[PDB]
Symmetry: C5
Subunit: 335 residues, 5 copies
């Protein structure tokens, strides 16, 4: 097999058509699965099959039929192959169990198919301002390293049909949709122009889970503090312990939520809702202090000279009305 | 040993019977142990022995007896060997201590046995909707990379007897059972058809542990709030602190359970039970508020004009009846 | 040095005495240190020196004295060496700083000493039913990969004296003792019989630490709830808050203990003790509810017609007696 | 391509101009992205493109035009290349997917361009005394390993214009600014002098996030304890539970904050503020004890012989005044 | 450069002076930085420069001046080099970015300088009985692997001046001091005697941080329980809730401290102080139970027949005196 191909009779350190027009190379991609996603480091891991198509007359061999030959990764070190690399990637490797996952198929006229299986991790900027209602977009980029557009031309072989996805791809806490491909030209100041390929998709969260865990407990505790407005003001040993204990219960809820969320160090949409509810509970404690002080002053004044309080009556209306107004404004901005 | 075999006289870059019928290859598998399982990344790790059987007349050597020769991993780089790989795997490697774990045995007539020891990690989709009563199924897949069904034929050498398991295989938090093997054909649009092999097993949890840790504390606290229905309504400084403190105790239990469970971001069966019990505790606090307000109004009305309350009597019956009805419906759906 | 030994004149791909009796190989082991132990994955890491002894007449060289030659790891790739591997191991590697840790010493008559330094991680099944009083046993296994008992014979060179241990070996949370060696034969259905070597040791915990952290706080809280049996029954605002707060304190202790212990998902000995104490605290709360209800009924009955309660007197005796009986049964079973 | 260049006719183990003046080498750097930063281990990870420029007459080839040739990483092992390394680095590696990310361009007159893509992790000393208002500075260093200033001269090719940064570089919890380059000479006692290059940048935090999470809850609880100064002193069952519960609430806040912050084991600016507020809450509990004791003594004295207390009046003024004074001093020192 | 040195004319598999006296080798060490320290696994990571000095007449080359030649890591595989390795090390590696960090300098008369940059992790036994006042000592060991003292002699080239340290070496939570070097002979039963080198240093903690976080909160809570001794005994709804809540507050502090400290599973100095304070709080709760019971009995006895209690008076003196005595004994033992 190494004698039909003129391996030793040709210099394979130079691209086909050296000194002439650029050689076109086609790319096909099949996505196998998505492994994991990190919200702190802002990256994702993908596994895929990568295929290349090009023609090289130096690899032609005589044959009485159209039967193509198949080779392994050992022949790759001798023949010339493209050097595509993934831009903005953090780490990547090629599987080698039980051997290198590389195949080569050579047509009698010199057409070559080159395929390999590779896992790549790529960075992706994310914005958590609208958490947990945020929507994230990611992209993967493929580009030639050493050859500019004047020497190598890169394109999708079959347009938008060149991308295939496994039917079983899924994520534990995200929903994946809208796979499509695009192309663009990249420029480097000290090297020149390059062709670049893109693979795009979108991610979404499960809204209903976060509503039950975070928004639901907060609302109940706020409504629970409104009970004290209906208890008799003369029961000092009852009104005071109820108010302070509700603040303690709210504090533990906020602390627990922060520990479960990722260590994102800036204000998010969920943080605004929780701390506003904390202020409402705090204001209810000061409300009884005014009632107690005024009642004591009035009783002492009558003794020196010798029914529901007005504050309680209005608090029963103002407090529920203010909280509903806050919800309408909050949900109108954050959809 | 390298001269009895015609290593230099044959081209080993081509499969035996090139240009003719497909060469059949048999596979035997022995499972050694299961290392770990991840519920967040949805993958498992397995260690096993992999063996191949095929015939190659080019490796025949003259011998006066049936004594077969044994070689090492150094000879593998010269002779032709199958290229089986594990589909949907994330990472894998071959052990090399103190040397490569590869053996070769060649019969005088050219029959070859090839064995190696390899550890492989494979993905597995899991559903946690019925946690902690869920049951999970996993599979491992073996397939040829470069050779289609027209060139290489893959099958189990001895049918269902080709799979062996160690007697000491176990998991810390799962029960393993139902090992069996199956086969199926896989199709690739741009390459063709391939034979694929499967190894299947099932996993189960320990039910009684989760009942004690999660379901048991929740039931006791709900029954504890029903005590307030039997205390005298005139003891305002006693009824109110009891109600609010029970809500605080329930909140800490729910927070602790979430931290221990894996970060699965959707509603599970256990979450439904815990939050329904929280509502029952919340409703008991509002029940006393109605009793206290009505009692105060009645006393003031009598003074202006100049025994167990009905709500308490019915609450002693309705609340226990409602909770039992919930349990019957809940346990009938989730088995 | 490469010319006194007939490296190029002999075929080193075959074991000495090919076609004849099995070649005996001796093994010496010196344990350097134990690195770590994992209770969730059930494995341990060990570092050791491994030495081999065998005779090969093909490596003899003429010498006027008994001065043996010393070589490095480069000569290993040429001469034949044993292929011992560690069974049931998860991962292992050979150190290479600043170079490969391999030595070779060849006697004039052909005796060869082969030594290397290797770190190996091996699995070990553990049972935590009797935690924290459990005792664990571990073993390490060494076996030849490719050569059966008919071709290679493996044995300890000096019996039980072949195992040496460093004087400074220790673990942070375990006690190591009882190092000894044993041998056994292993059988493989498709390959044959093999000789196997074993290294055994035992591990124990520090009992007194767990008693102070877990058992000590639980006992104090149970005894603390018995105080309410001596307080006047007329102090309703005192008896009720004391009972409910003790339940809250007990709940936080149980939650904290679970977080510190490893994620072992089945019932252990410690879990039984903690939850039984929780029931004792729960029963004390219901005890006062019966006293309060009966007192209220009696007072109302006397009014309609126109001293320590018996329950409190017996509770002072029954509750302390029941808890002591539980301790005697619990400690008699779990030693 | 390997015959136009006199690879076999020259000794490439010696630098160009051996025995003569030092060869000047230029460096260009383009920063791609920052991956992560660790506050416990005090290091950061950076990915960048590194380029070298030098002239070597031994690589000249005849050509009728100015068309330069392009090669791959295979030619690097034959020709002489600079040996730049990153000082104070912990770990680094060169990407190799799908092949080595190395390019070579050779001009007809012998000018050589050498480029590679590398990820490097470097240490950086940090001071957390002024947390969370601290500002950190980092640097990256490049130096030749084996060749001193007498043999190799290292400099920026285009001065301060040699550094380029990606437009999308960002960090999750830090702000990056002030990229600039500097140079300095380094001296080694046993080897000599070396040229060193520097890349500098500055990092800042998000101030407003930490104020809401830490400073905001602490202030509210302190103001909440001042309420007890306005409640009637005769309500013993109300004043005492309010005071002790506030201490409990403050303790949980401090514990939660420590768990979220990195394990920095020395006093920081934030720790001072939290513990001073704890003392203010503690002092309020002792204040009521003095009032209660004095009131009891006065009442007993009057009985034996047969209005707001002064302490409460002053506490309403002294306590708010003292806390405001603390804030002015605290914020004047820590800006 | 490969022809002035007689690489092919000499057998470099044997040490210089084979069959004669031992060859002396000198070592110089410069410490660059300390990366991290682990208190659970008991190991530390260090990065350093290692240099060797020896003479080999086989590498002499003719020269008209004293100009020494410089080489790279490629020549190392041909010439003979020492095989120093780090004893008791867990893992180590040599940096290779952008190339191997190895240099060679050969004098005309055959003197050779060999330098390399390596990162090594070594074990270190630690004792935490006196935490957080403990002091730890660490050591690093260098030894020849294959050559005994009869063939290779190892020594510091310049005595105690051979060790250099970077001015910027620091740790986040430890203080490093007292760098010095020592030497000792090591014996192996089956191999012989070896020379060993040592590098020693000492580590200390920041005392004041742990006092504020652990000792300070514990003392305040104990003093807080002494307040109840000054409140009127007739206020049953005040004395009882104060006592039980203090126990709850103390329990949360102890749980939080354990989570922050490393998982060291034996009794430490800090644990003794915390649990003794817990007993003091527990005893105060039982003290009021005796007062309440005796008061009730006396009142009932007077009714049947028809002022500060003594226990409270003594408790005001005995309790403060006992705690001060404990501190004097505790701090006298643990310095
Ligand atoms: C489509 C095509 O190129 N077919 C070729 C044909 O020219 C040749 O004669 C035959 C061999 O049998 O098959 C092949
Ligand atoms: C079963 C089989 O093929 N046996 C062969 C036999 O033909 C041969 O004569 C003998 C050598 O002694 O053993 C072998
Ligand atoms: C114990 C043994 O085999 N010793 C041999 C001896 O025969 C030989 O004559 C001498 C060389 O001087 O030493 C060696
Ligand atoms: C700027 C420069 O050096 N240009 C050279 C020129 O001398 C030569 O004649 C031409 C080839 O066509 O291009 C190239
Ligand atoms: C100190 C020493 O050995 N120096 C030698 C000297 O003998 C020689 O003549 C000169 C070459 O110019 O320098 C070198
Ligand atoms: C591929 O299909 C997607 C579908 O959204 C479309 O947006 C995109 O433009 C298509 N690409 C090409 C190259 O036609
Ligand atoms: C192997 O045995 C299992 C037992 O469950 C059976 O389901 C399966 O069909 C068998 N496979 C073959 C190939 O007979
Ligand atoms: C080695 O000594 C141990 C000591 O416990 C003993 O049990 C074991 O049998 C001995 N082994 C041999 C091979 O004598
Ligand atoms: C590069 O620009 C920065 C801008 O801050 C300046 O400080 C620095 O000195 C400049 N360097 C040189 C070499 O001019
Ligand atoms: C090196 O100096 C240290 C300083 O503490 C001293 O203890 C040690 O003995 C010295 N070593 C030698 C070899 O002189
Ligand atoms: C008390 C909770 C009130 C919630 C009001 C929600 C209004 C949503 C409008 C879009
Ligand atoms: C108060 C707990 C009642 C539990 C009822 C369980 C019924 C199970 C029916 C299958
Ligand atoms: C209240 C604690 C009683 C403990 C009794 C222990 C008995 C141990 C018998 C072996
Ligand atoms: C009660 C909070 C008072 C805060 C005062 C802040 C003063 C800032 C001066 C720079
Ligand atoms: C209430 C705290 C008393 C502390 C006494 C410390 C004495 C230290 C003597 C060395
Ligand atoms: C499944 C319960 C959702 C509750 C949402 C409450 C939003 C205010
Ligand atoms: C802390 C509450 C003070 C209330 C004062 C009311 C004066 C009208
Ligand atoms: C927040 C409630 C204020 C009510 C004021 C009533 C004045 C008469
Ligand atoms: C081992 C106790 C199990 C309790 C189950 C309770 C289910 C309602
Ligand atoms: C918050 C409880 C209000 C109860 C009102 C009862 C009216 C019948
Ligand atoms: C949830 C209990 C309701 C009881 C209503 C009784 C009306 C007389
Ligand atoms: C929940 C406690 C009820 C007590 C009833 C007692 C009847 C004898
Ligand atoms: C658990 C204590 C029961 C006491 C019953 C006394 C009946 C007179
Ligand atoms: C966004 C609220 C900031 C509050 C700062 C308080 C500083 C005393
Ligand atoms: C613990 C508080 C004691 C208060 C004593 C007051 C003496 C003037
Ligand atoms: C901290 C308040 C002290 C007030 C003292 C008043 C003395 C008359
Ligand atoms: C649990 C406290 C009992 C107190 C009894 C006192 C007898 C003198
Ligand atoms: C721990 C205080 C004991 C006081 C005893 C007093 C006896 C008269
Ligand atoms: N094709 C990417 C690239 C990097 C570089 O330095 N020149 O080109
Ligand atoms: N046999 C698997 C496979 C991948 C590919 O691209 N062609 O075949
Ligand atoms: N010696 C172990 C082994 C594995 C195998 O397949 N045959 O032998
Ligand atoms: N150029 C760095 C270095 C290290 C050394 O030992 N000599 O030089
Ligand atoms: N120099 C260390 C060593 C190990 C061994 O087995 N012989 O020597
Ligand atoms: C926050 C309510 C205060 C009311 C004072 C009249
Ligand atoms: C939730 C019970 C309310 C009863 C009102 C009559
Ligand atoms: C659990 C004790 C109940 C007693 C009822 C008489
Ligand atoms: C801390 C305030 C004490 C006041 C005593 C008169
Ligand atoms: C712990 C104090 C008990 C006192 C009994 C007289």
């Amino acid at each position: 097999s190494e004698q039909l191909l003129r391996i030793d009779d040709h210099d394979f350190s130079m691209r086909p058509g050296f000194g002439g027009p650029a050689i076109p190379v086609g790319v096909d991609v099949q996505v196998e699965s998505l492994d994991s996603i990190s919200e702190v480091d802002m990256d994702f891991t993908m596994t895929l099959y990568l295929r290349h198509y090009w023609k090289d007359e130096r690899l032609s061999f005589p044959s009485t039929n159209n039967l193509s030959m198949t080779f392994d990764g050992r022949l790759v070190k001798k023949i010339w192959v493209p050097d595509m690399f993934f831009v903005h990637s953090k780490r990547s490797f090629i599987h080698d169990t039980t051997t290198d996952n590389v195949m080569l198929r050579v047509q009698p006229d010199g057409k070559v198919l080159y395929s390999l299986r590779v896992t790549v991790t790529a960075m992706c900027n994310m914005d958590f301002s609208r958490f947990p209602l945020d929507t994230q977009t990611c992209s993967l980029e493929i580009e030639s390293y050493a050859y500019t557009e004047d020497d190598l031309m890169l394109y999708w072989k079959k347009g938008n049909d060149s991308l295939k996805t496994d039917e079983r791809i899924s994520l534990s806490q995200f929903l994946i949709q809208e796979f499509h491909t695009t192309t663009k030209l990249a420029f480097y100041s000290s090297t020149g122009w390059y062709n670049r390929l893109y693979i795009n998709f979108t991610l979404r969260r499960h809204i209903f889970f976060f509503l039950l865990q975070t928004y639901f407990p907060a609302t109940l505790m706020v409504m629970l503090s409104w009970v004290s407005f209906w208890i008799d003001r003369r029961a000092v040993p009852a009104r005071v312990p109820l108010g302070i204990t509700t603040v303690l219960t709210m504090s533990t809820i906020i602390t627990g939520v922060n520990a479960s969320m990722p260590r994102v160090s800036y204000i998010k949409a969920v943080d605004i809702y929780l701390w506003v509810s904390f202020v409402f509970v705090f204001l209810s404690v000061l409300e009884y202090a005014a009632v107690n002080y005024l009642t004591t002053v009035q009783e002492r004044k009558e003794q020196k000279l010798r029914d529901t309080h007005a504050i309680d009556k209005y608090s029963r209306i103002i407090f529920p009305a203010a909280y509903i107004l806050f919800n309408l404004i909050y949900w109108s901005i954050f959809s």
